[PDB]
Amino acid sequence: DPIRRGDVYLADLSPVQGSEQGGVRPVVIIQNDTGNKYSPTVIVAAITGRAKIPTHVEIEKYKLDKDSVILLEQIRTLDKKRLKEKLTYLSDDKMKEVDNALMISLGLN
Amino acid sequence: DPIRRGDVYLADLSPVQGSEQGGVRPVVIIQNDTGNKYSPTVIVAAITGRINKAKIPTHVEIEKKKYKLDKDSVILLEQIRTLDKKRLKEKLTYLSDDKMKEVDNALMISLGLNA
């Protein structure tokens, strides 16, 4: 498996345009778990290889090829078919950080 | 002129896959205005023609009369994405403060946030 918020998957994000984050990489699920259970789509934030940016969350400890960063300014809705290997899932504390970054990114406060 | 949260732009979402919303269509800007000013990208939510009355927590309806829209429409806060600004075409309108509050609420729900 069931897809859950906080899970990290591999996903082919290509193709992309301009300054969009592309290439088959890791992403973290940020959609609520009702949508994750039933809907054909999920919402994710891009993760990339590694400053102090309010919309960025660092992740060391997570089965990752390198020290990475979650980009909360880089988010999108993907068909579940795009999801490949499940890698890990983030701690409750790290998800609190993601939640904070996401609020700032989307001007939610 | 500047791109502002709550603005509605016509935008090119193609190409996409499966149930991802594609096509050239209205989107609403949901990124904060610091990003909208300085960043090469914006984050938006897709808007589609209202195909049926339905009470969906992640959906927010828009009045065709109230705004400059071809049809009665609905904002899909489960269909969002980060777009290079070059994908934005014409600025169509912008949403009221009250309508934007509904959007923020639908967005909190969609993204499993609560406050």
Author numbering:
A (entry chain B): 0 to 49, 53 to 62, 65 to 113
B (entry chain A): 0 to 114
From the primary publication:
TA modules are small operons encoding two proteins: a ‘toxin’ that interferes with basic cellular metabolism, usually translation or transcription, and an ‘antitoxin’ that neutralizes the toxin and protects the cell from its potentially destructive activity (for reviews see 1–4). The toxin MazF is activated under a number of stressful conditions via proteolytic degradation of its neutralizing antitoxin MazE by the ClpPA or Lon proteases, (18,30,35) and was proposed to be under control of quorum sensing. In this paper, we present a method to obtain large quantities of active SaMazF and provide the structure of this protein as determined by nuclear magnetic resonance (NMR) and X-ray crystallography. The SaMazF dimer is formed by pairing strand S6 from two monomers to form a dimer-wide 10-strand anti-parallel β-sheet.
